[PDB]
């Protein structure tokens, strides 16, 4: 179903894999998707994250507290956690419910919030944001460009 993803949505996905690599994780989790959303930049959810007072290095470090780097770098692809799997499912599902047929970075952020049970959401609330906060906020964004 990844063919629906926009150029930058997919770029988020590739980036999430690089984040989980160089922080030495054997899985891509809800955090690493947040990380890739940030690291993306030119697209929606990244500017959305610099607006609601969330930056890259904060999430990096928060993960290095609750997760911390791994002893041994993994190579080859890095599998999703069931949390990340559900986030991507729901990103699809959000996208469809807002009418679009593509899936952009903003739709991954919405799916992420929808899951709200895993590390991404723990990290977010720890940094200074809220789930329906950023949801309604990014919805206002799709209303404001």
């Amino acid at each position: 179903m990844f063919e629906r993803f926009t150029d930058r949505a997919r770029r988020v996905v590739v980036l999430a894999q690089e984040e989980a690599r160089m922080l030495n994780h054997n899985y891509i989790g809800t955090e690493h998707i947040l990380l890739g959303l940030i690291h993306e930049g030119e697209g929606v959810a990244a500017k959305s994250l610099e607006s609601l007072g969330i930056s890259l290095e904060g999430v990096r470090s928060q993960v290095e507290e609750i997760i911390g780097q791994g002893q041994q770098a993994p190579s080859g692809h890095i599998p999703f956690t069931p949390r990340a799997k559900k986030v991507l499912e729901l990103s699809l599902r959000e996208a469809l419910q807002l009418g679009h047929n593509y899936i952009g970075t903003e739709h991954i952020l919405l799916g992420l919030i929808r899951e709200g049970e895993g590390v991404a959401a723990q990290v977010l609330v720890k940094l200074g944001a809220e789930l329906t906060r950023v949801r309604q906020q990014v919805i206002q964004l799709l209303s404001g460009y």
């Binding site: 993803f5 997919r10 996905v13 894999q17 692809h77 599998p79 799997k85 991507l88």
Partner: peptide, 7 residues
Amino acid sequence: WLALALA
């Protein structure tokens, strides 16, 4: 789609 990379 949906186990890893862009699968």
